[PDB]
Amino acid sequence: SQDIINSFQSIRQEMEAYTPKLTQVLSSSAASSTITALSPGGA
Amino acid sequence: NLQEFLGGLSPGVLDRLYGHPATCLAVFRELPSLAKNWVMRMLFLEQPLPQAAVALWVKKEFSKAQEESTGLLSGLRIWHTQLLILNPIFRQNLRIALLGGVPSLDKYAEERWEVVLHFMVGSPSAAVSQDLAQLLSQAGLMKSTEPGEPPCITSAGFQFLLLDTPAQLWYFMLQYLQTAQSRGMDLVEILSFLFQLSFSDSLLNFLQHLREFGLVFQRKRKSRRYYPTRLAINIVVETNYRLYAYTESELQIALIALFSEMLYRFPNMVVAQVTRESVQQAIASGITAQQIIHFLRTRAHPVMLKQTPVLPPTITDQIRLWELERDRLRFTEGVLYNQFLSQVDFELLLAHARELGVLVFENSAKRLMVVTPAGHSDVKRFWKRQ
């Protein structure tokens, strides 16, 4: 029971710096490769 | 319609039309069913996907809705071929809309818009503003044909009264925008101002025209900023032909009297009746029965908007069946020619008759060919000169 008390600690400090929206939500490279994933020739 | 107007437009103004909160959200809000999905799919893309992909993203069933969507979606010039990457002016400003980059307001709007509609009826409390009378007559719903102490109301003005309250305003701005190119300002800044109102120096003069119909509220005689109203967002009927109307506004009563007849008038209720001799009194000017049914379905009572289909079906085709008594004996003009013993020449004349688009009726026994008198002056030349 040692990693629960710090992972709950690490997620509390993370929620102060928040909401980037413009470029930090997606990238042009990863979203374009996703088009190949849901194409009829992909997965 | 909105996309009817933007379809007949040059690309030289649509690129400067796309402001960040106003226009890119407005054109995106009117895209039919599936065009809204493709714009959101390639909103975050940068490399153009191949052209054969979007044909295969739909089923074989409902494949006809694919081309009419992209026919509009390329008609407004949102993407192009590029070899379908979107417009860089459109993709940038729409991404701004995804977080990028007081009862006095309402009661003023209804009483200021009602006096605009009272100008189209006979009333001494008319909208006394000479700029609006010349605005309506060039739009084509206030016939004068004289100087005139009153202005008359033509057949198109009768159809304007029974249009919906958002839908009659879009027909009104489209005639404001179509004539403002030579008397007002550029089309770009006035159209993007309406869409920014939906959510220079010459633009203050356009604001004082919206002050007359009621979409802004000044309240202190042309201050710095305005106050938008609820107009700037964009009764029962029985089996025995009676309609009871819980309104008391004098405009809404005379709109019932166009196609009904009054028989009592209490406070807060008016009972009228849809009869044969009163619908045909309205159709004879032309307020035709597809507009009467749409008038009562948008203005219906909450107790009518229940588990039954609204406007119960006995009364919704009896108004249609009373329209078709005018539909008998459709007159049309023509000129005849006959009395030829040649049994090939009436067949020979068919090769010289159909290609102008002037023939009306065809016969096979005696073969009466009838031509309009606008196209009769040249068919008489062919008969005498072989």
UniProtKB/Swiss-Prot annotation, chain A:
This is General transcription factor IIH subunit 1. Belongs to the TFB1 family. (Microbial infection) Upon Rift valley fever virus infection, interacts with NSs leading to ubiquitination by the NSs-FBXO3 E3 ligase and proteasome-dependent degradation. The chain holds residues 397 to 439 of 548 of the full protein. The gene is GTF2H1. Component of the general transcription and DNA repair factor IIH (TFIIH) core complex, which is involved in general and transcription-coupled nucleotide excision repair (NER) of damaged DNA and, when complexed to CAK, in RNA transcription by RNA polymerase II. In NER, TFIIH acts by opening DNA around the lesion to allow the excision of the damaged oligonucleotide and its replacement by a new DNA fragment. In transcription, TFIIH has an essential role in transcription initiation. Component of the 7-subunit TFIIH core complex composed of XPB/ERCC3, XPD/ERCC2, GTF2H1, GTF2H2, GTF2H3, GTF2H4 and GTF2H5, which is active in NER. The core complex associates with the 3-subunit CDK-activating kinase (CAK) module composed of CCNH/cyclin H, CDK7 and MNAT1 to form the 10-subunit holoenzyme (holo-TFIIH) active in transcription. Interacts with PUF60. It comes from Homo sapiens. It is found in: Nucleus. It comes from the Eukaryota.
From Swiss-Prot, chain B:
Coiled coil: none annotated. GO terms for biological process: DNA repair; nucleotide-excision repair; transcription by RNA polymerase II. Its main location: nucleus. It is found in: Nucleus. Keywords: DNA damage, DNA repair, Nucleus, Transcription, Transcription regulation. GO terms for cellular component: core TFIIH complex portion of holo TFIIH complex; nuclear speck; nucleoplasm; nucleus; transcription factor TFIID complex; transcription factor TFIIH core complex; transcription factor TFIIH holo complex. One of its GO terms (molecular function) is RNA polymerase II general transcription initiation factor activity. Component of the 7-subunit TFIIH core complex composed of XPB/ERCC3, XPD/ERCC2, GTF2H1, GTF2H2, GTF2H3, GTF2H4 and GTF2H5, which is active in NER. The core complex associates with the 3-subunit CDK-activating kinase (CAK) module composed of CCNH/cyclin H, CDK7 and MNAT1 to form the 10-subunit holoenzyme (holo-TFIIH) active in transcription. Component of the general transcription and DNA repair factor IIH (TFIIH) core complex, which is involved in general and transcription-coupled nucleotide excision repair (NER) of damaged DNA and, when complexed to CAK, in RNA transcription by RNA polymerase II. In NER, TFIIH acts by opening DNA around the lesion to allow the excision of the damaged oligonucleotide and its replacement by a new DNA fragment. In transcription, TFIIH has an essential role in transcription initiation. Belongs to the TFB2 family. The C-terminus (residues 305-462) stimulates the ATPase activity of XPB/ERCC3. This is General transcription factor IIH subunit 4. It comes from Homo sapiens. The gene is GTF2H4.
